[PDB]
Amino acid sequence: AEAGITGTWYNQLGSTFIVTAGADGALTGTYESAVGNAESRYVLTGRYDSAPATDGSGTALGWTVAWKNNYRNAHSATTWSGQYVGGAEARINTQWLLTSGTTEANAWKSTLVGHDTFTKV
Amino acid sequence: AEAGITGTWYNQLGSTFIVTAGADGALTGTYESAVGNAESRYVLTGRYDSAPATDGSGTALGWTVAWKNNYRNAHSATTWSGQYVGGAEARINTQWLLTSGTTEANAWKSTLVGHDTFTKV
Amino acid sequence: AEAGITGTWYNQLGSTFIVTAGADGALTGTYESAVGNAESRYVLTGRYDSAPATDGSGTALGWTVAWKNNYRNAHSATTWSGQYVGGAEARINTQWLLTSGTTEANAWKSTLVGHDTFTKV
Amino acid sequence: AEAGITGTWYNQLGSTFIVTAGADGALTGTYESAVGNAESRYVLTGRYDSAPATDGSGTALGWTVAWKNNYRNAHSATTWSGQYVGGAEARINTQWLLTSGTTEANAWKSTLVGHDTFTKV
Numbered sequence A, B, C, D: 001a002e003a004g005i006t007g008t009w010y011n012q013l014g015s016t017f018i019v020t021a022g023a024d025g026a027l028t029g030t031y032e033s034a035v036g037n038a039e040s041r042y043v044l045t046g047r048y049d050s051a052p053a054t055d056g057s058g059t060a061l062g063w064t065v066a067w068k069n070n071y072r073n074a075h076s077a078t079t080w081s082g083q084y085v086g087g088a089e090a091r092i093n094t095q096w097l098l099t100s101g102t103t104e105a106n107a108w109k110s111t112l113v114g115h116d117t118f119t120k121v
C-alpha cells in the first residue's frame, strides 16, 4: 500500500507520523511525539509488506525511531509493529516497545509496552 | 557504538544478524531466521543512539524486517527493541513484536512477543 | 475500588468478565471469551491494589484464566495487567499475554500480546 | 504438574516464588522481589493447565501479585504468563507485564515488559 501508507498520520496522543512507502518495501519519514522526553522531529526508518495478500487482510509493517535529534537525546528507541488497514477510514494499528539504555542493574525495567492507533484524522 | 555494533551476530535460535551502524545513527544489513515462515536473507533497517551516555549504560537501538524476499512472503513484520552492551562479551538484549497481516476478525491474535539475545558468538 | 470493580464488564470483542473485588485485594469470578479456543465460562483469579493513591490515579490490577473448563482445554493461559479508572464512564484498560504450552522447538512462538478495554457497557 | 510446580523457585534476579499447585488448577503462594519498590513477601494468586497434553509440551500457567503488603504499597501489579517445563532441570519460562496506577495523562507509560526464568536452583 504505497499510495495508501504514504501521508501524514496522527495517533490518539496527538503525535505526528509523516511517512513515504517506497516501492521496494522501505519506509522513511519523520516522527514527532506529543509526550515524553522529546521535542521536534526525529528520523524514522522501517519496512512494510510490499505485496500484501489479496484476501483483504491488513499489510504488516514496522518502524523505529532513536530518540536523538539536534535538540536532544533521550537515550532510548521505540519500535512500532502493526498492520495497515485500508478503506473508508484507513487506520494503522500498532503495538510498540520503548527501550531505554540502562545499567545492567536496571535492565529489568528498561522497556515499556503500549499500543497506538493512527488515522489520517 | 559504530565499531561495536557493526558485525555478524547470532541469537539463541541460530539466526544471523549482519549489521552496519552508520555514523548518523542508521542501521542497515541482513537478517536470516533459523525458524518460522522464512528462508535466506531479508533486508533490515533500524536506528540506534549514536551518542550514548558516558556512565556505562547500554546503547538503545531497534530494527525491523518485513518478511518478504525473492523466495517468499510471510506477510508479517518483526521489530526488535533492545540495547547494546559492550565489553569482554558484547551482547545485544532485545524484545520483539511479530505482527501478521490479518483480517479484522482475527486482529486480536495478530502479534507474538518474545526476546532474543545476540552475541558475536 | 471494591464497589467500583465489582460487576459485569465487556471488552471490545464481546467477552464477559464477571468479578468480585474482595476487601483484602482479591479478585475472583468468571470469564467467557467471544473468540478463540474457548466456550462457556472459565474460572479467574487475580489481585488488585486495595489502597489506591488519593491523587485520582487508576488502581493497578491483574488476573489470570487457565483455558480449561468442563467443556474443553486449550492448554493455554492469559494474564491481563491494567488499571481501573473510576468515574462517569468507568473503564478497565489492560494489556494481556496469552501463552500456549508448546514443545521447546516452538517456544519462540508461544505467546501473543494485545490489549482489551472493559466497560460496564 | 501439581508435584512438579509445587516448590520454591528463584529467577535470574534472585527473586523467590513459593507456590502450591492445587488439584483444581489453582496457584497460591508468596512472592518476594530482589528489586524494585518492594520488600518482604507478597500474596500471589494464579491458575495453571491441570491436564496438560501428553506429547511432552510445557504446561501453561500465570499468576499475579498486587504490590501491597503490610510494609508498603507500590500501587502496581505484575502478571507473569509462561509455561512449566519438567525434567532433569525443571524450569518456568515467563513473560510479565508490570502496570502502575497512573493519571490519564501518563497512561501511555504505565506498563513495563520483561521475562523471567525460574529454576529450583
Ligand SMILES: O=C(O)CCCC[C@@H]1SC[C@@H]2NC(=O)N[C@@H]21
Pocket (backbone or CB within 6 Å): A011, A013, A015, A032, A033, A034, A035, A036, A037, A038, A067, A074, A075, A076, A077, A078, A096, A098, A114, A116, D108
Ligand atoms: O521519553 C522518551 O524516551 C521518548 C518517548 C517518545 C514517546 C512515546 S513512543 C510510544 C508512544 N507513542 C507516541 O507517539 N509517543 C509515545
Ligand SMILES: O=C(O)CCCC[C@@H]1SC[C@@H]2NC(=O)N[C@@H]21
Pocket (backbone or CB within 6 Å): B011, B013, B015, B032, B033, B034, B035, B036, B037, B038, B067, B074, B075, B076, B077, B078, B096, B098, B114, B116, C108
Ligand atoms: O513466520 C514468519 O512470519 C517469519 C518469522 C521469523 C522468525 C522470528 S522473528 C522473532 C524470532 N527471532 C528470530 O531470529 N526468529 C524468530
Ligand SMILES: O=C(O)CCCC[C@@H]1SC[C@@H]2NC(=O)N[C@@H]21
Pocket (backbone or CB within 6 Å): B108, C011, C013, C015, C032, C033, C034, C035, C036, C037, C038, C067, C074, C075, C076, C077, C078, C096, C098, C114, C116
Ligand atoms: O485460544 C485459546 O487459547 C483461548 C483464547 C481466549 C481469548 C483471548 S484472551 C485475550 C483476548 N481477550 C478476550 O476476551 N479474548 C481473547
Ligand SMILES: O=C(O)CCCC[C@@H]1SC[C@@H]2NC(=O)N[C@@H]21
Pocket (backbone or CB within 6 Å): A108, D011, D013, D015, D032, D033, D034, D035, D036, D037, D038, D067, D074, D075, D076, D077, D078, D096, D098, D114, D116
Ligand atoms: O516497583 C514495583 O512496582 C514493584 C516491582 C517488583 C519487581 C519486578 S516484577 C518483574 C520483575 N521480576 C521480579 O522478580 N522482580 C521484577
